[PDB]
Structures are given as C-alpha cells and as structure tokens.
PDB file of C-alpha atoms and ligand atoms in Angstrom:
ATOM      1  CA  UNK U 267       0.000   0.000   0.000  1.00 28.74           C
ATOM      2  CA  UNK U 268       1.357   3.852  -1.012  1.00 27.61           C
ATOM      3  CA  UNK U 269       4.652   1.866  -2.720  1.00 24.98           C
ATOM      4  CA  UNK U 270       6.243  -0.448  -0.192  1.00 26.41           C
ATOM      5  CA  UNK U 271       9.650   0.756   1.226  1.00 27.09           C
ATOM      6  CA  UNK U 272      12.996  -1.205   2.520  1.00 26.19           C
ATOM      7  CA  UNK U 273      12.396  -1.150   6.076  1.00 27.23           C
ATOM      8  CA  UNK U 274       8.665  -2.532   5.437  1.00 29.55           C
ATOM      9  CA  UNK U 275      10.183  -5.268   2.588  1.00 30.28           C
ATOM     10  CA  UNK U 276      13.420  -6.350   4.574  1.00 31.09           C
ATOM     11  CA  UNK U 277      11.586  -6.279   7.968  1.00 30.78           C
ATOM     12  CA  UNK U 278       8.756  -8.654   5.677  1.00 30.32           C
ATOM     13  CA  UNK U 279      11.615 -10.760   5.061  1.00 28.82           C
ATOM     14  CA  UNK U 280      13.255 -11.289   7.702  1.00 24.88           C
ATOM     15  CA  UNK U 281      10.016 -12.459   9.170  1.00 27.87           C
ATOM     16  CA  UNK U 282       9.464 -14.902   6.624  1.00 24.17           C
ATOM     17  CA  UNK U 283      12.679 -16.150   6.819  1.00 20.80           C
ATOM     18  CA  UNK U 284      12.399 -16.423  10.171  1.00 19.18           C
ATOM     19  CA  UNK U 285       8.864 -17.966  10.122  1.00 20.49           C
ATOM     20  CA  UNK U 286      10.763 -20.872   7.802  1.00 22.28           C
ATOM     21  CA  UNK U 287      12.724 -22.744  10.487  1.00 23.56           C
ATOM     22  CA  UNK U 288      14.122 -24.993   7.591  1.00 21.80           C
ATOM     23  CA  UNK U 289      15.160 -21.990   5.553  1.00 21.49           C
ATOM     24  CA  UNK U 290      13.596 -23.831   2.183  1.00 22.07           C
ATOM     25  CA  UNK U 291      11.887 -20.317   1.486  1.00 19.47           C
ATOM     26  CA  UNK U 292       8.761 -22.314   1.749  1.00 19.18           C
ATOM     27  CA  UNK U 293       5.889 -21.921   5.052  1.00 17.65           C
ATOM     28  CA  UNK U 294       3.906 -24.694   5.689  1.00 18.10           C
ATOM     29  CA  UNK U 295       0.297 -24.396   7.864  1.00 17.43           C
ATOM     30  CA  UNK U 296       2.615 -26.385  10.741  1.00 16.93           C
ATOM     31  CA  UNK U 297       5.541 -23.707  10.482  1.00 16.59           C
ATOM     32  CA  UNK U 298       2.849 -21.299  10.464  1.00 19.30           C
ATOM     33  CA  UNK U 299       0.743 -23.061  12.753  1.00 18.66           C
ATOM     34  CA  UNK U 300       3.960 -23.036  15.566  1.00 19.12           C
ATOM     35  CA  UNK U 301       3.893 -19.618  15.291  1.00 20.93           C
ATOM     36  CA  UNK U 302      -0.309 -18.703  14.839  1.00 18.34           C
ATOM     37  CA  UNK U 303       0.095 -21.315  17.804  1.00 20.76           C
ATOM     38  CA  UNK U 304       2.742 -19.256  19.326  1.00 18.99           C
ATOM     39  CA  UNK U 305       0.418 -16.167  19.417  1.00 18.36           C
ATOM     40  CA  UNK U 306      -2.279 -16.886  21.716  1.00 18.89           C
ATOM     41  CA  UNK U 307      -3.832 -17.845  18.020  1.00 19.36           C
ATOM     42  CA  UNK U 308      -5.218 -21.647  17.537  1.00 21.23           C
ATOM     43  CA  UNK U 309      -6.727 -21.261  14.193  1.00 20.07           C
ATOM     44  CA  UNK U 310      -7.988 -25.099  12.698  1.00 21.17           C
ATOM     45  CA  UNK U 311      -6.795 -26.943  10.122  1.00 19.64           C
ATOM     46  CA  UNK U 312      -9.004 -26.277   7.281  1.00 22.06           C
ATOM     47  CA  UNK U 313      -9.030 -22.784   7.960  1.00 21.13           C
ATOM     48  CA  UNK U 314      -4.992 -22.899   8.168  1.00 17.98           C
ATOM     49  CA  UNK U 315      -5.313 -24.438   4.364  1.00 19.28           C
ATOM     50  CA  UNK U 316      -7.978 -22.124   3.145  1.00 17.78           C
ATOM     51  CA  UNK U 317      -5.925 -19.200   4.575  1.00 17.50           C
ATOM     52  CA  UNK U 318      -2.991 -20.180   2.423  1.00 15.26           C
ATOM     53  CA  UNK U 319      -5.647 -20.941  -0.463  1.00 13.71           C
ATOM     54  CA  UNK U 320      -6.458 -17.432  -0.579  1.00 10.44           C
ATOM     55  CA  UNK U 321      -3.376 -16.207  -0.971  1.00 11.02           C
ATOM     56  CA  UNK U 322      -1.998 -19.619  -2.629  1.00 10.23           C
ATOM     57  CA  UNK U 323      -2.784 -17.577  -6.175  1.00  5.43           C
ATOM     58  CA  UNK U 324      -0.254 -19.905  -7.523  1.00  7.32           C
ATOM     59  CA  UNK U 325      -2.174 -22.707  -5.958  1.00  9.00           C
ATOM     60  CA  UNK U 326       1.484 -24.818  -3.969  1.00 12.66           C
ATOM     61  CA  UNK U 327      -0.225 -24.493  -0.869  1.00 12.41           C
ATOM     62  CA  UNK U 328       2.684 -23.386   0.638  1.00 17.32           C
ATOM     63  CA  UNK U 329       3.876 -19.606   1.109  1.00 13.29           C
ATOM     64  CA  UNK U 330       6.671 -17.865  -1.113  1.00 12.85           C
ATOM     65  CA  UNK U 331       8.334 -15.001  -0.307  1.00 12.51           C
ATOM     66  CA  UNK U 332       6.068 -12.685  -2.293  1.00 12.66           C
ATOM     67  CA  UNK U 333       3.575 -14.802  -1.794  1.00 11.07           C
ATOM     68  CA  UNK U 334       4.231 -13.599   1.754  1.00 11.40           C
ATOM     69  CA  UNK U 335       3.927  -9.811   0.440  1.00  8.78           C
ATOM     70  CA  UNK U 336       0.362 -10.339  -0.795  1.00  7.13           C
ATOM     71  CA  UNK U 337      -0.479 -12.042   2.169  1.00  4.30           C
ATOM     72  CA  UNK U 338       0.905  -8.863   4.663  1.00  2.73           C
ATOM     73  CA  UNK U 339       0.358  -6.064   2.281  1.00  2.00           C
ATOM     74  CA  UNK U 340      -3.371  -7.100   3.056  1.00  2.00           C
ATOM     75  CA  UNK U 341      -3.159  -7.699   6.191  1.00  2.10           C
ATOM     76  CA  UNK U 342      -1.707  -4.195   7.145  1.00  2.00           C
ATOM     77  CA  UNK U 343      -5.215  -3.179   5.636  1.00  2.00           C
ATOM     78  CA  UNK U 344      -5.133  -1.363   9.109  1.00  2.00           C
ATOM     79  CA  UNK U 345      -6.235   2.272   7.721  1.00  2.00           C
TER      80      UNK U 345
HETATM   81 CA1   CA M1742       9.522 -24.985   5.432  1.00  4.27          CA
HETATM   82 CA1   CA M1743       1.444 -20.137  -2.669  1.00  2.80          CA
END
C-alpha cells in the first residue's frame, strides 16, 4: 500500500525467513501453525489451508516469499 519501502520489505523478510525454520523459502500451515500457535492464536486446520488458499494464487499451498507480500500487504489493511 502507497509503494512499499525497505524497512517494510526487509523487515517482511526477515520475518518470513524467520517464520521458515528450515530456511527452504517455503511456510507450511505447521511452520505457520507453531507460530499462529505461538500467538495466543489456535486457528484449525481447514481454515490454516484455506488461509494459504487465498493467498496460494499460484495454488502450492505453501507460502513464497512474495507470496508472503500479498499475504501482509493485506493484512496491514489497518487504515
Ligand atoms: Ca519450510
Ligand atoms: Ca502459494
């Protein structure tokens, strides 16, 4: 939203990286899970899948690191 900057993008990715405990560049609902888990957050399984669904425009059902970008530049919908 209003052109993403480097502090927003590397921040972004050093949270993804982070979120990818195997450092494949790939999140999966369990790595995901450990940390929605993590956060007082206990989302279920199908919803875990759909969530990635939404976002899985590529349809892997697994998260990139742009993939990623989608997936937070809506989420910071936060006006
Ligand atoms: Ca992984
Ligand atoms: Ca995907």
């Amino acid at each position: 939203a209003d052109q993403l900057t480097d502090e927003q993008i590397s921040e972004f990715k050093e949270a993804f990286s982070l979120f990818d405990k195997d450092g494949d560049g790939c999140i999966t609902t369990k790595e995901l899970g450990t940390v929605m888990r993590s956060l007082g957050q206990n989302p279920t399984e199908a919803e875990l899948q759909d969530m990635i669904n939404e976002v899985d425009a590529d349809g892997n059902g697994t998260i990139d690191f742009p993939e990623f970008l989608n997936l937070m530049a809506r989420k910071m919908k936060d006006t």
